[PDB]
Amino acid sequence: PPTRLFRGLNLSEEFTKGLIDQANAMIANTTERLFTDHSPEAFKQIKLNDLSKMSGRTNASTTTEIKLVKETWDSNVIFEMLDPDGLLHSKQVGTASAFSVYLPEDVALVPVKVTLDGKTQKGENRYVFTFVAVKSP
Structure with a gap:
């Protein structure tokens, strides 16, 4: 995944x-x-x-392509999840980059960074919040 x-x-x-x-x-x-x-x-x-x-x-709902988020909803906040253990039970839905995601009670999205990333079409700052998915100690 x-x-x-x-x-x-x-x-x-x-x-x-x-x-x-x-x-x-x-x-x-x-x-x-x-x-x-x-x-x-x-x-x-x-x-x-x-x-x-x-x-x-x-x-x-999630996507592999940050651009799809930008072009579809022009979000001012984007959540970036790093899941090298595949603790999100990711499943393709479709649009071939769309995935469906489940966050278990023993998986935390650990925030590691907040980063400016240009501006929305309305001229808002867009920020990307990066997380790594970890299991409960």
């Missing part, structure tokens, strides 16, 4: 600004504790924040 998948959300200016700060506070202060100590608490905290609004979902 594909190890990089994208999905976009259109989010408000106010909310995006707050989502970037939350992401950055986790990358600096919660994901080190997951990545160095293997803290079971870190993991839980990560699942609880659900930065990308993914938790519990069983057929959330």
Whole structure:
């Protein structure tokens, strides 16, 4: 299965600004504790924040092609998931780059980076939030 998948959300200016700060506070202060100590608490905290609004979902729509997200929904926030263990139960749906995705309760989307990536057709900053999918310690 594909190890990089994208999905976009259109989010408000106010909310995006707050989502970037939350992401950055986790990358600096919660994901080190997951990545160095293997803290079971870190993991839980990560699942609880659900930065990308993914938790519990069983057929959330994704694509291998970030451009498809840009051209179809022109999302200002794009969620990039790195799944080298295939813990997302990825299934092709179709459009040949469309995959359907399930995030188990013992798989966290660990945020690792937030990155500016041009502008939407409306002239919003577009941001990409990158995650690595990890199993519970």
